[PDB]
Subunit: 301 residues, 4 copies
């Protein structure tokens, strides 16, 4: 046998950081969960009980906290790049660092209409994430995402014209509920190293904001022909607004809300135009995915 | 043997309702999870295989949807009262109905600064709940609550002066992080029946709002001596603002954030006044409870 | 205002203990999650910021580990009694200790047909629990339970003869799937103190075993008329086999498996006697409860 | 813009099947959760609101149940292959089907030492999984796995000789607890189609059994130098025992159990050779991965 692939490290490292402005009294908090997995010339730890090549996962954990103490933790794309760059530069034999960060929401409370200087609310379980792959000799590849953004619209969703054969029972509809949990990923142009990441720092927060704004507005305003058609519109708009992202990926469940026929009980009318009470379905669910890039076709468009 | 207690019914009944204003186009959505458990002269279903006394749980489920079609689902205190009253009035042999409702957040989206007529966001996993116990001959007992309201403050929390003995290692502190998941319950005066519940309907939304406002403002503004002292202030204020509630209960975890001594690494200073990077602790956690009522002591105050 | 009730302590304290037989090499492991909440003359911590009356929850945590080091952790009824007794005896002003223990399964592995001396498998997420309430001047009240015991039978379950009215759509059945997650609790006679608990120590493991055996055999062998009728049989048998338990409580979901009519597709027959493929339903679910004690009726039986 | 990748279908489809032997009375149950995602000439559903190319996810769901009615559901590798082959053969424009199956445990109960004909217990949340990718013109690629197999050993695990630098605080150990949740995947040689899958059917159950047996025995018996070294031994043995699998992948958390120094309290000795009571750590955790294949090196071995 032989080792074809290997990576190892520390997962589920919870990290908080506070910034305190001593002039104004305003404090700002950041909370994340971090995973760092390393690759390199480590195969003998697996094959020969050679622990000399192992940077202990406990040491990886310590390094996460030390790096957070010595650098900004925001935007996460930058923190992840700093953190991954450290491991490949510090250890000659480590040739890749794979950094995943989940950012948790701590939104400043407004009390009596004024922003509070040091009190925060978890206003959504929506996350902002990064995956930063720092590969020696091949730069820094960053995928940014928002996830767990849960939305519903009560009309202006349709689904008709789909294929019908002997496996088909679904009724066409011209007015349904649409609800989903949005997972949206934008993948950046390869960066050559930390300097180039730093040169684009403002674009990280701005592109996250754009992605979130476009998602919400498109979901709310598109009289949707399908999940497929709506998510494509989101992706194409995000690509149009940031030339440094190469692709946009969406992964959307269709979280079904079923009508309930109550006509068996006193002729109650609760379907079609009279549908008011619905049964949310926990499972099964549609799952719709696509990855959108920029076109390169010049004929047969 | 004999049956000392029994209740049975349907749990985890997911319910959505939409209201559509055909004049304005504005739609409003409600989503809940409902449990109804019945008591009564049902012991022979357990002891004698006598199913004649069982209102099938499937029928309880149907009744939940029928009741939602024929009545408002808001405030939940009212919907639960209507629903429980139905079972004890419809079935001579059913003498109590225990209705639990969890209300899920669907907050209207603002798009380009304007409220959208039919698009919503799950802006928090915070719930608004009711427990409505409708007991034949003994009225309607209602406990209202908010839960899963997760908050953090980065300073203005203290914990010193606690008992110290041979089991004590905890260091006193004059400046710590405080974070919790708020579970707050207000229990109403017994209502005689559905008419009396209806006579107080506006007070349900108003008292929920008061409870939430008081919770947030007190948490943010109290330079806290302990979880105990802060939660008591919340409770006393809520009681002062609604004479129809008899008690207020809080159940608060202390979700610890630990300092991280990094002085072993290059003399990094990350404790006390220089603490910036902390380790959120998933477990264990403090758990602090109290039930506050109005005082009846006249001497030795 | 005034404090009507209060309790506080440490929750989610994970504890492992190992026993090593140095003669045989056989090691045995125990893992639990412990909560201890205290009551007493503690109201001034809430009302007056008086922390002097607070045994810190961190100190409660330390005490859990110290008690586990100095005593057996099995049976959990004994460990909980020792632990609760400590707090009311050590602290004059603490008058009750409420100890909840969840015991996690670590079952010894058999390797090549032989029990391994130090390797274990989590063979089920089924738990064994205790709730031990140690109340100064009122002894020790113990509720023992098993929970998360998930079972299914594919036939020999029925449900017919239930009430039918204008809310009823459920079809009677003479052959259905029955599946549940068993939560079974046996409540012991009040014990006067730790000596009396110790005097009954072997009965704890034996009664847990009896409860589990009776549950499984009754579920498997009863041609069930309803969840109600089957669970009653379980309870009555457990009471007959241990005179020191006063009541037995069951709480059982009915986790529904629905037939799927496929006759719309090529006349496929998948209902009634030809039902093979079913749709497990995640929600809603029946929820059936009862508490059974010994009879005291002498007439009109 | 243009669609670079797309797949869509139905997720979280819960499926039960029963087999009834009418001669013997013995019934056997199977329960799974299935996801099927399709690829093909479907880009116009995203770009042009062309639903004609969409096989509705509801129809995919129906097809899952119909396929389970008309074929064996075991081994899952076979069921997934049948199911994926259907979609690419039935629909000219569908060119890949991606079938994920999670198999849930229903182990036959033994009652009074005899196997019960129709009663089952969920004896572990351990799963048996498959991922079957059926790609038109490129055969059938199958990855089989076991996951959620949770184990602990109380000694015969070590971790010393790891890299030590200015980021290192971890103490070397020659005797620690090791616990993990095993996720093990074996990837099969590409199969040309359903006939070739069928020709190997007995090998699926046999290789799953081998993988599980090797995992347990190696974990129990290896005096482990590291997670890395132990998991490699597992992989190499599985490869030696089934020539039709190309690689074996493990993904193992190191679920840490920390010693607790209690020497501050009455000189209690609970470290090193006297360690009995430990603190299980929920997070962070080591995460160790590798993919092992057969060697092709002929020099510098
Ligand atoms: C309702 N529904 C299905 O059954 N499949 C699909 C699909 O692919 N896309 C939808 O928007 N809805 C839907
Ligand atoms: C830190 N801490 C403990 O250890 N116990 C307690 C308590 O009862 N209350 C607190 O506010 N904090 C705290
Ligand atoms: C199917 N079903 C209901 O709908 N209610 C009930 C009940 O109370 N008990 C059952 O055993 N089954 C059942
Ligand atoms: C304890 N520990 C670390 O900190 N890293 C590692 C590792 O890579 N492998 C281990 O087996 N243990 C371990």
């Amino acid at each position: 046998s032989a080792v074809k692939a290997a990576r190892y490290g520390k997962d589920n490292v919870r990290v908080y950081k506070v910034h305190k402005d001593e002039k104004t009294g305003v404090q700002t908090v950041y909370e994340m969960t971090v995973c760092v997995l390393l690759e390199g010339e480590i195969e003998t730890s697996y094959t020969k009980a050679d622990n000399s090549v192992i940077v202990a996962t406990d040491s990886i954990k310590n390094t996460i906290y030390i790096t957070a103490k010595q650098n900004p933790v925001t935007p996460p794309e930058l923190f992840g790049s700093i953190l991954g760059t450290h491991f490949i530069e510090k250890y000659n034999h480590i040739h890749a660092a794979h950094v995943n960060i989940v950012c948790h929401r701590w939104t400043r409370m407004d009390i009596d209409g004024k922003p509070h200087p040091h009190s925060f609310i978890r206003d959504s379980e929506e996350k902002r994430n990064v995956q930063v792959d720092v590969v020696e000799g091949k730069g820094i590849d960053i995928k940014s995402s928002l996830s767990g953004l849960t939305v519903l619209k009560s009309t202006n969703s349709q689904f008709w014209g789909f294929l019908r054969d002997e496996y088909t029972t679904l009724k066409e509809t011209w007015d349904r509920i649409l609800s989903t949990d949005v997972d949206a990923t934008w993948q950046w142009k390869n960066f050559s190293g930390l300097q180039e990441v730093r040169s684009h720092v403002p674009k990280f927060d701005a592109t996250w904001a754009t992605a979130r704004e476009v998602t919400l507005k498109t979901f709310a305003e598109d009289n949707s022909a399908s999940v497929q058609a709506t998510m494509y519109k989101m992706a194409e708009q995000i690509l149009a607004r940031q030339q440094l992202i190469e692709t946009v990926e969406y992964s959307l469940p269709n979280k079904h809300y079923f009508e309930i026929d109550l006509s068996w009980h006193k002729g109650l009318q609760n379907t079609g135009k009279n549908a008011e009470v619905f049964a949310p379905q926990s499972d099964p669910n549609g799952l719709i995915k696509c990855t959108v890039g920029r076109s390169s076709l010049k004929s047969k468009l």
